[model samples]
Target chain A: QEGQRYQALKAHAEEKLQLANEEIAQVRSKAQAEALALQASLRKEQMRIQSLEKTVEQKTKENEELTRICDDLISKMEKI
Target chain B: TQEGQRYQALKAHAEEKLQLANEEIAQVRSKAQAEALALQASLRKEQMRIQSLEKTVEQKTKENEELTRICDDLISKMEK
Candidate 1:
């Protein structure tokens, strides 16, 4: 009878230990997955911002060139 | 009795490991969350800056077009 009781206690404790291990694995894996997802989003946004900055730089250059052309035209009219 | 004592030790060890795992998980999650929030704020600011730059570019384009039109009319008058 004592042997049976000892077996039961051992089984219960092992089950509990297995549960704890499973919970730890699940929580850690979930956290790691979420962190990776957030990092991907951050990288995407950074790339988008880089592209936008390049576009703005090109537009500013074009505007400056246009302004200079207008100034030259006005000067020509004054001379005529 | 020896088996029972061993089972008790295993249970206690599992509980301790579970507690430590939970604490580590919380720390990792908190740091990840904070980093995500910071990235979001940075993305928002970059978007706003891009929008303002585009608006300026649009305005400059219209101004330049109008100036070109005026220059064309002046040239036509001079030719006549």
Candidate 2:
């Protein structure tokens, strides 16, 4: 029984090491999964913002062109 | 004396391993926190960009309506 105490200590430490390794792996895996989710969400938001900005640019161009056309018509009518 | 020596050696080895495991967990925790903060900051920037895009789109759309009204006014005045 006295000799067995050493064996038990060795086994206990080994088991603790194994548990530690598992915990390390579990934390790493969780962090990776969350990182992926965050990245995916970021990408989607970026794409949506890009599309809306493009639409804004196009609409701005159209508005300016319309304003130019309308002002030209006003000048022509005033001359008449 | 031999058993005592072996016991001391085993205890020291286990202590070292436990220390290593604790250090590993601390490193992992720090890295995970840093990564989460980075991702959150990135997401916040993207969300701000999205808000800006929406604001621009709404402003342009409202301006488009005003431009249409101006065009109508010009046409009606010319007809009169």
Candidate 3:
């Protein structure tokens, strides 16, 4: 009777271990996926910043050119 | 009973494997979380930069438009 009871307890422990390993596998998978998603988001944000910087540069050049043209025309008109 | 001995051995082996798996998972999870946190912080800064850049572009566009309008008005006045 004692031997049979011991056998059952061992079986129970083994089953608990199996469940624990499965839980660990799920958590591991989730953690990796989370990390990957974070990296992708970071890359996307970097690209957006780069694009905005380029636009600012282009607009600044255009603004300078427009102001120069106006300044020239206004000065000529004043001389007249 | 011999059967009891076999059950004990199996249980011990399973427990060992389960314990190691948990430890491995714990290590992996902590590393992944730390990496994700750093990436998130970087991403947030990039997003803020993009927002500020967008605002700058918006302000510049308005100014450029106003400059063009003024040039048109000045040209018309000079012709008149």
Candidate 4:
């Protein structure tokens, strides 16, 4: 009877250890999932910022071209 | 007596493992939370940058329109 009780106690301890390991694994996995989601969101935001910057660059170029044309026209008028 | 000592050893080992697992879980959660917050902050800054870029684009568009109008007027006067 004593031997049987000892065996049972050992088994219970082992089970508890296994449960703790499982819990740790689950917590780690959940954290990884959350980190991945946040990384994806940050990446999307960066892409949007890049696109907006490109648009600003294009607009600036267009405005510069227009200013050059205006300057040329004014110079020609002055010469005339 | 031997069985009792063995059982105590097993119990102690299991308790130590459970404590370690809990510590690991807490550390992982804290690190993940910190990383997420940093990413969120970066995303917010990017969003603000996008807004500023959009405003620049709007200003450039208006400037382009004004330059176009001036060019048209200058061409008309030249022709006259």
In candidate 3, chain A reaches a TM of 0.79
Pairs with backbone N, CA or C atoms under 3 Å apart (clashes), candidate 1: none
User: lDDT by residue for model 3 over B4-64, one digit each (tens)?
Assistant: 6876787678678878977877888888888888888898899999899999999999989
Q: lDDT tens string, model 4, A1-80?
A: 67787677778877877887888899889888988898898889899888988988889888888888889878887898
Better lDDT candidate (1, 2): 2
What DockQ was computed for model 2? 0.65
DockQ of each: 0.35, 0.65, 0.60, 0.65
Per-model TM-score, in order, reads: 0.65, 0.82, 0.82, 0.80
Chain A accuracy as TM-score for every candidate: 0.77, 0.75, 0.79, 0.66
Q: Per-residue lDDT for A1-80 in model 3, tens only?
A: 76777667777877877887787888889987998888888898998888999999999998999999999997887899
Q: In model 3, where do residues sit more than 4 Å from their true spots?
A: A1-5, A75-80, B1-11
Question: Model 2 scores what on Cα lDDT?
Answer: 0.86
Please identify which of the two predictions, 2 or 4, would achieve the higher lDDT against the true structure.
2
Residue-wise C-alpha lDDT for candidate 2, range A16-64, written one tens digit per residue:
8898988888888988888889889988988988899889889999898
Error of 4 at A27 (Å): 2.1
Every candidate's lDDT: 0.71, 0.86, 0.86, 0.84
Please count the clashing residue pairs in each candidate, in the order shown: 0, 0, 0, 0
Question: Order of all candidates by lDDT, from best down to worst?
Answer: 2, 3, 4, 1
RMSD for each model, in Å, please? Answer: 3.6, 2.5, 2.7, 2.6
Residue A74's lDDT in candidate 1: 77
Docking class of 3: medium
| Model 4 spans with C-alpha error above 4 angstroms | A1-16, B76-80
